[PDB]
Design a protein around this ligand. Structure first.
Ligand SMILES: [Zn+2]
Lengths: 249, 48, 134, 73
RNA sequence: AGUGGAGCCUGCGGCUUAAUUUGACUCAACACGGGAAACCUCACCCGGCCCGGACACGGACAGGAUUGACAGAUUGAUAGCUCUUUCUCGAUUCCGUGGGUGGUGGUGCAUGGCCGUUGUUGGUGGAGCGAUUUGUCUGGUUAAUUCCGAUAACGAAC
């Protein structure tokens, strides 16, 4: 009714927004009850990059992880997937928007990482950019470990190894069930006849430099058999030498 | 759940996973009247 | 002194220990042998078009470019050119070249001056201690 | 290929503006009697969600809320 | 019929400017960049805020790290990206330092993914050791090695 004209006006504001102080009606959006209708009136597909960055900042600042979850699932990730496919790179404002979305890790993991790696259509450039965005942000140990376990459980793609390796690069202490799952994953590549990219080999490598102190003898020989069956002229001797130069417990 | 187990030397934390995978008004017209006053102050037309 | 004459160059190292650093002989003597100090100024071509470019960081004023206008620029990848006009109030300038510059490239100019030796002549030399290794 | 000199140049950016750190701000919220009674110096908001916990910033004339932006005189 | 001579407009040089953005110079340089630009459209100029990675080391943080923020004062701009107000937000941390260490880099090389169908020059023959030549030519004809015809050439592909 009468609020529709105001929200149409701020919709027209957001279509040409570059900077400045936002209208105060936008800053009280997560306090509303029927917020999805208001968001559909504001037309998020027509927002600019800085306006969407400030929208992500507003929704991340106002708690309520489920609303941020549905906002990241419905609005932010389709815009990122559209923007990478067009300009072959991510904008500065949207990069800062995903950083401000990693200001809340719980809504980000279930909202941006897991749907992208579960869709199966994630390209290389999206995977590299997003994994660098995780790499930039300091992350909780339990959250990163659960993301590790979930990525290790799902089906393999060329993108998934990039996230797996870049989460290994954080070098935190890992829960042992997660180590069991990733060992089961790499042993799931024991009998695969598909040719593997260099990213899988590098991910396994960085796993062997970092977590060689927490490898039991059985899985040590299992990864040795994995190196035997799936060799590489350069990286396989490195993993093999790092395996013979490891102390357990 | 895998088969091979970490066996020896301590578990510091149990880790919580059963919450992630198992997951899946006067103010309005006050702020809107403030927005009305704000864009009515955009072109004031009256003050000398 | 008249050649032939052998020439030795020593350096006072420490504790009166003379270290032989150079040796040779005496060439023809004249003060007309010109010694030229060269100073190379480097700039980065940051806007590349065909046969002309916009180059920054070589200078920082506007009249500085106008001062060194008659000096031609060369290039580490072998191009030769000259300054056309400065544009910025900072040290931005237009440079024409014979070919097209790479994005990996770097423009540079050579300036030359004559330098004369110092007058630090004194016939007194300290007596060396016996030489030993360290 | 041909290498670059990497011009050094110094510029001091060590001085950047930072907000002042308030140490032990829990002291001014409550006053404790010798018997053990608690006196609330600041108003508690009767809001929808952040009630019974959020105290008010005391301006020169007015009290202000810091979670839901509540307005008074 | 004009143009070149006159006024105006527009383009390219040249001149000024802080900037008067830019590739192409006798057709394919010359109202091409849909280019009729007062903000965007702009590549140019003059100034002013913001922050610009991971990793290692040393600090602070739970005796809050930090985010968000109403009103008023400021600079050329409603700069909570500063002050009075410091209220909430519970680690999602930010402060120095060191590394030709670096990555949402640039560029080149190698090789492969997405779609279906099964006038020039050869093949064979002749000539010469070979470069080469015949076909691809007396004549008539044709825009044309085209056609009629002759014929050590006969067939063809584009
Ligand atoms: Zn508030």
């Amino acid at each position: 009714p009468r609020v529709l004209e105001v929200y149409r006006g701020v919709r027209e504001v957001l279509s040409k927004y570059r900077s400045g102080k936002l209208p105060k009606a936008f800053k009280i959006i997560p306090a509303l009850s029927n917020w999805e209708q208001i968001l559909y009136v504001t037309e998020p597909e027509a927002w600019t990059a800085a306006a969407m960055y400030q929208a992500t900042r507003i929704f991340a600042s106002n708690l309520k992880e489920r609303m941020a979850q549905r906002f990241y699932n419905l609005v932010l990730l389709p815009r990122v997937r559209d923007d990478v496919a067009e300009y072959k790179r991510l904008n500065f404002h949207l990069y800062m928007a995903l950083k401000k979305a990693l200001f809340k890790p719980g809504a980000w993991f279930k909202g941006i990482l897991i749907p992208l790696c579960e869709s199966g259509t994630c390209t290389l450039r999206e995977a590299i950019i997003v994994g660098s965005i995780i790499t930039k942000c300091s992350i909780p140990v339990l959250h990163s470990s659960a993301a590790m376990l979930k990525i290790a459980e799902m089906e393999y793609s060329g993108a998934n190894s990039i996230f797996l390796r870049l989460l290994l690069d954080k070098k935190y202490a890992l829960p042992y069930r997660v180590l069991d799952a990733l060992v089961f994953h790499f042993l799931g590549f024991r009998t695969e006849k598909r040719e593997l990219p260099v990213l899988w080999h590098q991910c396994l490598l960085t796993l062997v430099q970092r977590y060689k102190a927490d490898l039991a003898t059985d899985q040590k020989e299992a990864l040795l058999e994995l190196l035997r069956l799936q060799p590489h002229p350069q990286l396989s001797p490195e993993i093999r030498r790092e395996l013979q130069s490891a102390v357990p417990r | 759940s895998s088969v091979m187990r970490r066996n020896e030397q301590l578990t510091l934390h149990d880790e919580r996973f059963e919450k992630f995978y198992e997951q899946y008004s006067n103010r309005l017209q006050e702020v809107l009247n403030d927005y009305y006053k704000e864009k009515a102050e955009n072109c004031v037309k009256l003050n000398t | 002194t008249f050649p032939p004459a052998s020439v030795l160059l020593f350096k006072q190292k420490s504790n009166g220990m003379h270290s032989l650093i150079a040796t040779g002989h005496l060439m023809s003597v004249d003060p007309d042998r010109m010694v030229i100090k060269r100073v190379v100024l480097s700039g980065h071509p940051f806007k590349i078009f065909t046969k002309m470019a916009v180059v920054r960081y070589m200078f920082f004023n506007r009249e500085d470019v106008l001062w060194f206008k008659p000096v031609e620029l060369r290039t580490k990848w072998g191009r030769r050119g000259h300054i056309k006009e400065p544009l910025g109030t900072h040290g931005h300038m237009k440079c024409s070249f014979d070919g097209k510059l790479k994005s990996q490239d770097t423009v540079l100019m050579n300036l030359y001056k004559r330098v004369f030796p110092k007058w630090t002549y004194d016939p007194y030399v300290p007596e060396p201690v016996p030489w030993l290794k360290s | 290929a041909k290498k670059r000199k990497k011009k050094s140049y110094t510029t001091p950016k060590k001085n950047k503006h930072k907000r002042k750190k308030v140490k032990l701000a829990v002291l001014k919220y409550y006053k404790v009697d010798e018997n053990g009674k608690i006196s609330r110096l600041r108003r508690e908001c009767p809001s929808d969600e952040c009630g019974a916990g959020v105290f008010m910033a005391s301006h020169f004339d007015r009290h202000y809320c810091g979670k839901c932006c509540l307005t008074y005189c």
